[PDB]
């Protein structure tokens, strides 16, 4: 996260770290949506142009964390994956359309003060909250700058940007399964996700029922925190039927 601040303890208890077994490294963010399902970006797992193709056994999820590098004994829970499900129409060739994957944990994780699932939006929540100018929140242990790394989880609040402005900032073909967020160059505030934040949650807090909803997944962007560029996020609600299909069937 660029131009964010340190998270408070327990501020984002659905935050999940995707951690490579060997070598030991941070791969991506992710989020906890129930006691045994984790949501992330498909490109965190499968991206053939960089020869990336991770299987269940290559990865661990670390849940309840705050410090980036410490083993947070008695606080974090580390889980193994049973199965990864990538959206069948994930488009890694052209524009990262439908950049979404589910991961099923080998065993349910117990909830605690530091580990708690985020809600998925229904149609009504998406309709009322996904509006230009409304702010959501991105969290992650990714780089602090495009060209170093944070000691603890970082947080930044960012406004959703109007679709035409998103479209005109890039040569990539934007779809209905994406939205963009960030400040405009004239707005005098900054902030963005960066390398290592991918797959993490873009959340909003409903003013109707006071719950947090995951509206987005950190997907892509050109550099980090560049003027006139915006972060792109997978539109979780547009892909919810696939989510429900996988969870119901498996």
């Amino acid at each position: 996260i660029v131009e964010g601040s340190d998270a408070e303890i327990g501020m984002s208890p659905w935050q999940v770290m995707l951690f490579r077994k060997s070598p030991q490294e941070l791969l991506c963010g992710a989020s906890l949506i129930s006691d045994r399902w984790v949501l992330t970006a498909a490109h965190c797992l499968l991206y053939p142009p960089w020869d990336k193709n991770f299987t269940e056994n290559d990865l661990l999820v670390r849940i309840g964390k705050h410090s980036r590098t410490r083993y947070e004994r008695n606080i974090e829970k580390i889980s193994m994956l049973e199965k990864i499900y990538i959206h069948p129409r994930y488009n890694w060739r052209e524009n990262l359309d439908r950049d979404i994957a589910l991961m099923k944990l080998k065993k349910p994780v117990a909830f605690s003060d530091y580990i708690h699932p985020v809600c998925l939006p229904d149609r009504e929540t998406a309709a009322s909250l996904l509006q230009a100018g409304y702010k959501g929140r991105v969290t992650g242990w990714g780089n602090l700058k495009e060209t170093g790394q944070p000691s603890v989880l970082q947080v930044v609040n960012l406004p959703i940007v109007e679709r035409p402005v998103c479209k005109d900032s890039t040569r990539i073909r934007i779809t209905d399964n994406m939205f963009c967020a960030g400040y405009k160059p004239d707005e005098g505030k900054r902030g963005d996700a960066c390398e290592g934040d991918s797959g993490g949650p873009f959340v909003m807090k409903s003013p109707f029922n006071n719950r947090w909803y995951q509206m987005g997944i950190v997907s892509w962007g050109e550099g980090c925190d560049r003027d006139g560029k915006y972060g792109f996020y997978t539109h979780v609600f547009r892909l919810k039927k696939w989510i429900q299909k996988v969870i119901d069937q498996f």
Binding site: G10, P13, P117, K135
Partner: peptide
């Protein structure tokens, strides 16, 4: 079900340091 209600914040009626900024944006 209990989703999206944080044990250290919503469940205790405590607010985090910047959540008001989100709420103030929801016009």
């Amino acid at each position: 079900a209990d989703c999206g209600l944080r044990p250290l914040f919503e469940k205790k009626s405590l607010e985090d340091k910047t959540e008001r900024e989100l709420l103030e944006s929801y016009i």
